[PDB]
Ligand binder design. Structure first.
Ligand SMILES: Nc1nc2ccc(F)cc2s1
Ligand SMILES: Nc1nc2ccc(F)cc2s1
Lengths: 209, 213
C-alpha cells in the first residue's frame, strides 16, 4: 500500500500517471496538489527574487512550508527533484518502492528556498535527486519518471540489453540472426551475452571501467 | 522553427506537453502525437509479438513501425528512440538537437522494438538510440517528455552543481539566510556560491569532478 502526493504549480502535468494506474486502487493512491492552494496573497505568489542576486526566481519558503506541513508526516519520504540532486537510479527506485508515503515537491524557476528542505529534514527523510545530466524547466517531468520507475516495482502496479527480434524472420532485406532460430539455447545465451558486451563497450563504456 | 512527431501506443500520455506548451503556443515548435495503431491492418490491431530466441515479454513488430516511420520521416529527420540500452542523453545532446528541423520520437513498450526498425531507418536518416538515465520505465513516453522539455527550452527564441538558493524572508522558522547573501558584496557572494557549488558537487556528484562513485 503506497500513497504518493505530488505538489506542483502545474497539476494538469500529472494527469497521465493517474490515468495509467490500473484497477489496483481497489495498493496505490496518487494525489496531485496545486501549490497555489497554500499561497498567502491575492496574487497567489509562489516565487520571489534570489538573495545575493542572480537570474530567475526562487520558490517561497513560506508557501512550501505550509504545503508540506499539511501533506507530510513523520513517516513521509520527501522527494525533491533537482538538477543539483543525488542521482536517481534503479537502486533508488527499488529502495523507494517499499515506502508507505512519498511526497514529491516539484520546483520551478531556479529551485526552492533551501530552508524548506533543511527544515523538513529535521522531522522527516528528505531526498534531493536528479534523474539525469540535463536541465528541465521544472521538476514535473522528473516526477513522472520517478513515479513510473518506482510504481512498476510495486507488485500489481552491469551490462546493456542487446537487440531483440520478432516475426517476420525476414523484413526489408534483414534476417533475424539465425542463432535465435537454432534451438541451441546455451549458444543463444552466449550470443546474447556477447551482443550485450559489444553494445555496452560502444554505448556505455563507463559501465565497464 | 522545429517540428516534433511522437509515435506511441499511448498518445494520451503525451498530453503534459500542452513551458513546452508556451513554446507551441508561440509557434516556435509544433508537436504532433501519433497513435502507432493507426498503421495496423488486422482487426485486433496487434503491434507486438513474442521474441525470437526466447525470453520474457513481447517485442514490438517491425512491420507496423516501418510503415509509421515511412509516412512520418524524411531523410532530414533525426529519429530518436528512447531505450535503457541507448547512448546517454545529456545536456550536450539537448544543445545538439536544439538546432534540428525535425525530431521524430519513437516510444517503445514491453521489451522494446525489433532492432531492424532502427537498422532500416538508419539507411535513410540519422538515428539516435538514447537513455535518459539508469532506471527502467514501462515505456518510452515519459522519456520523450523529458527529451522534449530539455531540448525545447534551448531553442533560439525560447559542469558543477548549482548551490542553494534563498529568498524572502531573511529569517524563517529560526533559520537565517546566509549573511553573505544579504551583504551586497558581489565578490564575496560569488566566492561563497562557487564554494557551495563545489561542496555540493563533491558530496552529491563526485564523478563530475573526476572522483570515484
Ligand atoms: N528545472 C529543473 N531541472 C531539472 C532537471 C533534472 C531533475 F531531476 C529535476 C529538475 S527541476
Ligand atoms: N521501457 C523503457 N524504459 C526506458 C528507460 C529509459 C529510457 F530513456 C527509455 C525507456 S523505454
Amino acid at each position: 500500500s503506497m500513497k504518493i502526493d505530488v505538489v506542483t504549480i502545474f497539476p494538469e502535468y500529472l494527469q497521465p500517471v493517474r490515468q495509467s494506474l490500473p484497477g489496483k486502487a481497489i495498493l496505490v493512491d496518487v494525489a496531485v496538489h496545486d501549490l497555489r492552494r497554500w499561497t498567502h496573497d491575492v496574487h497567489k505568489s509562489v516565487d520571489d527574487s534570489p538573495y545575493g542576486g542572480g537570474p530567475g526566481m526562487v520558490m517561497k519558503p513560506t508557501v512550501w512550508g505550509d504545503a508540506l506541513d499539511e501533506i507530510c508526516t513523520s513517516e513521509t519520504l520527501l522527494v525533491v527533484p533537482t538538477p543539483a540532486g543525488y542521482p536517481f537510479t534503479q537502486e533508488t527506485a527499488w529502495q523507494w518502492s517499499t515506502e508507505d508515503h512519498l511526497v514529491i515537491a516539484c520546483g520551478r524557476y531556479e529551485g526552492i528556498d533551501q530552508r524548506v528542505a533543511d527544515d523538513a529534514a529535521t522531522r522527516m527523510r528528505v531526498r534531493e535527486v536528479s534523474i539525469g545530466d540535463y536541465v528541465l524547466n521544472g521538476g514535473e517531468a522528473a516526477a513522472l519518471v520517478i513515479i513510473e520507475a518506482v510504481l512498476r516495482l510495486v507488485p500489481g502496479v552491469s551490462l546493456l540489453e542487446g537487440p531483440s527480434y520478432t516475426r517476420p524472420p525476414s523484413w526489408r532485406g534483414m534476417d533475424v540472426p539465425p542463432v535465435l532460430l537454432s534451438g541451441d539455447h546455451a549458444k543463444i545465451a552466449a550470443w546474447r551475452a556477447e551482443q550485450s558486451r559489444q553494445r555496452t563497450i560502444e554505448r556505455r563504456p563507463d559501465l565497464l571501467g
